Design a binder for these strands. Structure first.
Length: 163
DNA sequence: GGCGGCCC
DNA sequence: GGGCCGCC
């Protein structure tokens, strides 16, 4: 195996992601979100986290490392990663919205304030398997950071040695 | 038209 | 709250 079974399923969901495009490349919301979660999985940090702390932590990485003009709005990639089955959200009424729109996304997180994080099987996988971490880091760097310097982001996520 | 997103 | 773009 389930490590090999889960790793292949994990990497398949990551490769199926469809990020929004700028003129010169895909926007960095989803890879920055994922690498934040990968670092947390590696160090065994709390998988399930309150939205206020998740929003602030991802937002700070968006501000510092948003090399294609990203806004500090983690609501976009979190919703997209949830739809892909990579992210869990708990404590909300009704259905989770898609990452389409703007104000409705912010208002939904402000009202529902869901608790969540990377899905439990993938968090556990990346905590246990250094090979799975290296695999997804390389794949995300290949897809999203062509012509960009990922080193400051890797050190801010605690993944410099593995990336 | 849907979904990931920016601009008002 | 809205319209709209890129890509599917």
């Amino acid at each position: 195996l389930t490590d090999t079974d889960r790793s292949e399923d994990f990497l398949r969901r990551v490769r199926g992601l469809k990020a929004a495009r700028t003129a010169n490349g895909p926007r960095l919301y989803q890879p920055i979100t994922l690498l934040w979660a990968v670092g947390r999985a590696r160090r065994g940090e709390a998988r399930t986290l309150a939205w206020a702390d998740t929003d602030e932590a991802i937002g700070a990485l968006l501000k510092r490392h948003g090399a294609r003009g990203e806004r500090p709005r983690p609501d976009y990639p979190v919703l997209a990663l949830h739809r892909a089955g990579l992210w869990t959200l708990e404590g909300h009424v009704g259905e989770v919205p898609t990452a389409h729109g703007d104000s409705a996304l912010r208002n939904w997180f402000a009202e529902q304030r869901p608790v969540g994080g990377l899905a439990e099987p993938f968090h556990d996988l990346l905590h246990r398997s250094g090979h799975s971490r290296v695999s997804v880091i390389e794949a995300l760097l290949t897809t999203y950071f062509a012509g960009l310097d990922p080193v400051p982001l890797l050190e801010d996520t605690g993944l410099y040695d593995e990336g």
